[PDB]
Amino acid sequence: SFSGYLKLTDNVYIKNADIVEEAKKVKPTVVVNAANVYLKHGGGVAGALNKATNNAMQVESDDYIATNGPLKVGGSCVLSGHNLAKHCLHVVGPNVNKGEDIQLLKSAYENFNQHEVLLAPLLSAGIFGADPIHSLRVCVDTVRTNVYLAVFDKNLYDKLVSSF
Numbered sequence: 001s002f003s004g005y006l007k008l009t010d011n012v013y014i015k016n017a018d019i020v021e022e023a024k025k026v027k028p029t030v031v032v033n034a035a036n037v038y039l040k041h042g043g044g045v046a047g048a049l050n051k052a053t054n055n056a057m058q059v060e061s062d063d064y065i066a067t068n069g070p071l072k073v074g075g076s077c078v079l080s081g082h083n084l085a086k087h088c089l090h091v092v093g094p095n096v097n098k099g100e101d102i103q104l105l106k107s108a109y110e111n112f113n114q115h116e117v118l119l120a121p122l123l124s125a126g127i128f129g130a131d132p133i134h135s136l137r138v139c140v141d142t143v144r145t146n147v148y149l150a151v152f153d154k155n156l157y158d159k160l161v162s163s164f
């Protein structure tokens with residue numbers, strides 16, 4: 001039921017949209033969160049998704065970390081999607097503003113291949129400090145399953161499409 005997306009490749013689609021409003025409308029099987037290793041959803045996409053769940057995402061995430069410990073950079077976990085989706089795939093891309101290695105971005109996108117279809121943001125972009133044009137290139141060259149990318153900033157969406 002995804003609508004208004006521009007087809008970039010056989011399996012990658014993109015739209016200028018707020019991933020929160022997109023999730024509420026579609027209720028996809030999987031929404032991807034741009035997580036950190038501690039699942040502390042303070043800002044960016046994670047802060048927005050968590051606020052839309054009335055903090056239920058953060059309560060579930062704190063129980064997951066108390067049991068399992070932190071994720072790896074490049075890793076992921078599957079938790080509830082709450083009121084937004086059936087599942088939330090929390091994926092940790094490298095944070096360049098914390099000095100993490102951009103080379104781990106391909107490993108982060110490989111987590112998407114475990115799900116037939118996903119609603120997602122660009123990993124390591126925004127407050128994680130990587131170049132979004134690079135993040136879209138790694139996405140297209142790594143993900144083989146059907147990915148619907150929601151880009152919040154209109155100016156960035158136009159730059160990503162015009163330079164693809």
Ligand SMILES: O=C(O)[C@@H]1CCC[C@H]1c1ccc2cnccc2c1
Nearest residue numbers: 019044045048121125126151152153
């Ligand atoms: O698409 C973007 O412009 C950026 C790229 C990196 C993460 C994206 C982002 C960031 C904050 C968001 C806040 N609310 C809703 C969706 C949000 C999406």
